[PDB]
Ligand binder design. Sequence first.
Ligand code: MG
Length: 1268
Amino acid sequence: YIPDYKGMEPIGANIEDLVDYSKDWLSRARNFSFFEVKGTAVFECFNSNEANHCQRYPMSRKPRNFLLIQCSLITSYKPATTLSDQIDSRRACSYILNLIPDTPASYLIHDMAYRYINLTREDMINYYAPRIQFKQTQNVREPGTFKLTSSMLRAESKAMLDLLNNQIESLNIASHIVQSESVSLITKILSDLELNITTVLDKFFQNETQKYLIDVLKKTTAWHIGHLIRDITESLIAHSGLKRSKYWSLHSYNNGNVILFILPSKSLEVAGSFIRFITVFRIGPGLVDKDNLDTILIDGDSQWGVSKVMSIDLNRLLALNIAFEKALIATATWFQYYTEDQGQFPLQYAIRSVFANHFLLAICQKMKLCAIFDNLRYLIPAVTSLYSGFPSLIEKLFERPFKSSLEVYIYYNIKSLLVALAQNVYPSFMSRIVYKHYRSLISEVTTCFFLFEKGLHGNMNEEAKIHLETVEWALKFREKEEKYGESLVENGYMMWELRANAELAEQQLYCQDAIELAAIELNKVLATKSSVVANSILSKNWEEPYFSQTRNISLKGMSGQVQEDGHLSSSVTIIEAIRYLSNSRHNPSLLKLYEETREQKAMARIVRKYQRTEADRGFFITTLPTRCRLEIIEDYYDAIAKNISEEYISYGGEKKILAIQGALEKALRWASGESFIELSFIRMKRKLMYVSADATKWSPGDNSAKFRRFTSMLHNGLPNNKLKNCVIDALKQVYKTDFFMSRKLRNYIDSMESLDPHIKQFLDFFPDGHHGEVKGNWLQGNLNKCSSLFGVAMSLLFKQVWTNLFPELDCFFEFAHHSDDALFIYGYLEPVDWFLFVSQQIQAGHLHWFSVNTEMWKSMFNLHEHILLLGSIKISPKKTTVSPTNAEFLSTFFEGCAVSIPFVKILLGSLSDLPGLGYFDDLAAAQSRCVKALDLGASPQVAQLAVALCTSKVERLYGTAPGMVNHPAAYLQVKHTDTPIPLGGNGAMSIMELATAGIGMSDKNLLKRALLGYSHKRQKSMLYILGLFKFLMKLSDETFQFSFIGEFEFADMYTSKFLELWSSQHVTYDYIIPKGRDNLLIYLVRKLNDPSIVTAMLQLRFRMQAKQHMKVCRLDGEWVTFREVLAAANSFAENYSATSQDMDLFQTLTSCTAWKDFLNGIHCDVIPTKQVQRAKVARTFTSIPAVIGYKFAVTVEEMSDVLDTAKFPDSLSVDLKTMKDGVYRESLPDVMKRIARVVIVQGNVEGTAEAICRYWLKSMSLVKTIRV
RNA sequence: UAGUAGUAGACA
Ligand SMILES: [Mg+2]
């Protein structure tokens, strides 16, 4: 009932007081926090940091390894098969046995080759045999392994095995010798990798992309070496099973030239496990590092390189498996960007070198390189800006040991590139070309950065790193509390305290007057839309049940009760919901739950986000009362946030780019024309300086208590303060939290047995050794809408103070705040008399006017930063860049109105992130991410190439590819093109059709081509396809994208048959979430036992190799394999006979489901004009479950639940009828159950749902304009 | 100086 609370009393805060303080503070000399970029300054920073680094780390004479797998190719590579594998293994063992071992690695290789070549005939028959045909033997225990005891192991081999089963340094980068050696080595490797080995969309692809990219790259040794690495990694993954990992293995590739020896290892299924192997190759061009080779045996006029015993984890193994494609996709993206930039096609040598560099980066999956590229992606914007904090970025760059010889090469490259950039046409990073646009260079380095997989950090020395920041800032907060008193820090310091001390204006301390005036400036705007504000505030689920929302049902992850170990349990949200519902007697609303759990202390943990940044960020797992309080605050401020612009987090994930582009366009429109200043006119030029700003420590270095005062003065449309007081109390109860250290960190501390001083300082934060109190720091991600709104309010307060300071100048300001990320557009005035006016103003008693005489934007930013510090927002000196032409926001780059959104992240993620729901499901998902890239800016040719790559990957993984086990052609009497996708199918579909028509069209189109065959011709093959479709329909009906497809704590509280009966009885609950306690509890128990939920709660990517031959599909309510499903499909289609109802359904579906004809029906021709690139912009594409819940609603409880769920309470009936009409345009329970976008265009294109399709048709050609 | 990782002792 929203009980009353302690509402805060406003105090006498006056804007004039802040204006006077601003006058006094601006009347003196201020130190700019940014440095003007120069070639001399950047070079001096590099030299000084080199000198310091020479003594920071101990020198290392021997550069360390950087290539995970070493192999060499001199002829074209043919993919390996079982027969070729056996022949090559025989040849390779014969070659190896005629060599003299020198090192323990060579001795072990010789011993294993001798053992393999002496395996009996039955062993070699069972070796290479399929799983079904395999039989156990003395010498062979698994299809691709053999045993090796100590009896057949030499003394040296045993010694090296003991070495396996048993202080940081750096290279002298300041030395020219080390740099020269590293550059020469990496240049040799790249030159070896560049060597040559000796519809309308289809025609455009073959003319532009195939001719100039694929045909050029088909002969490079990088291409064939990528294929060879794919084969080697496939063999390694096959060995990494839970059964095969304990044995030895031997494989050979490329006519016995490359040999892989797999040592016993822990299976990659277990966490923190490595697979150990040795690769022996003939010395030649390729990924050869002579210094890091274990040995180079000398055969007769030949050299055999034996590499070191490499231990590779699952992440790096899966990265190496798909690295030909990550290199190919990156090269295609670079090709498209070069075409956009220079307007012509890249030459052969440039594209070959780019592909070689991308392949080398994809192979060397090392954390040091990932950190270097993470630093570089911020360093490049700093040196191309007018003022930036580049010295700090260079210092952070020099904070790493350059152990590998690749890191020295990349460091030399980035040093040269940054020195060249600061001295100025934008030089490229991996080529000798020079770009015409900064967006191309920044996209190139971003693409290089995205080639590194997420989670390359040390598994153990990162859980401490994620804790250190929180502990350090909590200690700083305690120090401030002891220095200034608990009351001052919690409630904020008065304005006179700031005027007297002047050291109070820092982080974790806020000024009450600043908060109040910021709230006043925001509610001045809010007074115009108070009605909408109240409507949005009341529109949230204040009185709705708490656990009937989707977020509280999800599996995201939350904490549990404190256990006897003293640690905080890690459960899922659904489990905590079930627990509380079981203990409670009713399902309370948000406010009722908050009142129930108000007295409980907020507890939290931290877990890794698994990013690719230099330092891994950890996100916090909060308990249930903490989640309730944060949801209250977030709902309130999000409701307020939407009705105010200049904050771009309340906006949807898709409207942010449109909003920021509109803001930039408004800034550009204002910049047009001049301004007139009254002499007391004078003409003044209107300038435009963007400031891409970031906060130093958004969450850790803030004081959440400030929001209290904000919420006490923010004006909403509500008549009473009950909700505002509830939000204030929720803010009060989230002030102090119990930060719990993880179990891994506790075990790490326990195993130490002797603590370093800094580990002791970290540990004393936790008194009992498990949890420590953290004050004033809202945990990361918990308060983002509120923080963005507060930042916008502070910016508006600064704008008001500036306007009151100099009313004679009509300056222009915009602010964009997406949490810590921000963009400040400053339109100031520049003289074309101004100095005389400034002198007169100074002599008139306005001592603060002298800050505007020259470079007024400096003083504007100084005042803005100080006013932001009057809260707790510290603009980061490092990652904030000012520039008069460019901007960076929301991970996108703006050239005025032009927008450049990276689309590489989802193109590369198509292969690396497969959902695993099912063959059709994951194939559609992978095809969907190519559509998203096509929306974000990828050209149709690049999207087509990427989609071909990922569907080839899915076909290879599931065996659907022709010639393999699960090829439907050999068991379904079809041509593999007339096969439904859920039962195989080609899956090759034009990206245009997926983008426009839909993803499942490849099935539906077939249906049409079936029906036209069955009606006009009555062919038996069409009847067979119809039977296949009927089998899919039957499976979809039996088991219950959008198409027909073919243990825990509380999961055992209700019987499975009880769940089935309940689901059959309460049909409506399949579409709506219940509201009563018992019904919601049963719904949640059923949700726990859903196979998709259990599977969802990468390891799946690795385990799919074994899952391929196991029973994963569902047939007649039984778990069966895919091959049996295909055989059943063949039998049922052969025994299928047509019926009237099926024919009627097919005619209705084919008549009601067309866009393909328009795509290929339009004409195209090359206009005699070269393609010109314009400033790209963004366009847009231009409750239902409740009515279905109404349809099956029978009981009073279900009727009440569906009534509450619907946005419109009593309109459902009418809506249902209208929906029925819609269905009749495109009633029975069966048919009812079965029925159940921003694109980066060029400037000219319209925003119609067909205009974007026409633009995509235009964009298929990359260098030539076309006409429709 | 077997690998990954690391100016947090890990995988073991
Ligand atoms: Mg930024």
